[PDB]
Amino acid sequence: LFSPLEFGNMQKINQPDVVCEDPEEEVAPASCSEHRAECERLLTAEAFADCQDLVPLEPYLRACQQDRCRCPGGDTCVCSTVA
Amino acid sequence: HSAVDPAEYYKRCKYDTCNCQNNEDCLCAALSSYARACTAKGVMLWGWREHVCNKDVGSCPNSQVFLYNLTTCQQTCRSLSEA
Determine the distance in angstroms separating the CA of B56 from the nearest CA of chain A, rounded to an integer: 18
Give the phi and the psi of residue A57 in degrees, each rounded to 5. -125, -35
Tell me which chain B residue has its CA closest to the CA of residue A19.
B22
Determine the distance in angstroms separating the CA of B61 from the nearest CA of chain A, rounded to an integer: 28
Method: cryo-EM
Find out whether B38 and B4 touch, Cβ atoms under 8 Å: yes
Q: What is the resolution of this structure in A?
A: 3.4
Cα B79 → chain centroid: 25
Q: Report the candidate in B39, B27, B30, B25 with the shortest Cα–Cα distance to residue B68.
A: B39
Angle separating helix axes B7-19 and B23-39, nearest 10 degrees: 160
DSSP state at residue A53:
T
B24 touches chain A (CB under 8 A): yes
Find out whether A51 and B58 touch, Cβ atoms under 8 Å: no
What DSSP string describes chain B? --SS-THHHHHHHHHHHHHSSSHHHHHHHHHHHHHHHHHTTT---TT--SSSS-TTGGGS-SS----SS--TT---HHHHHH-
B14 touches chain A (CB under 8 A): no
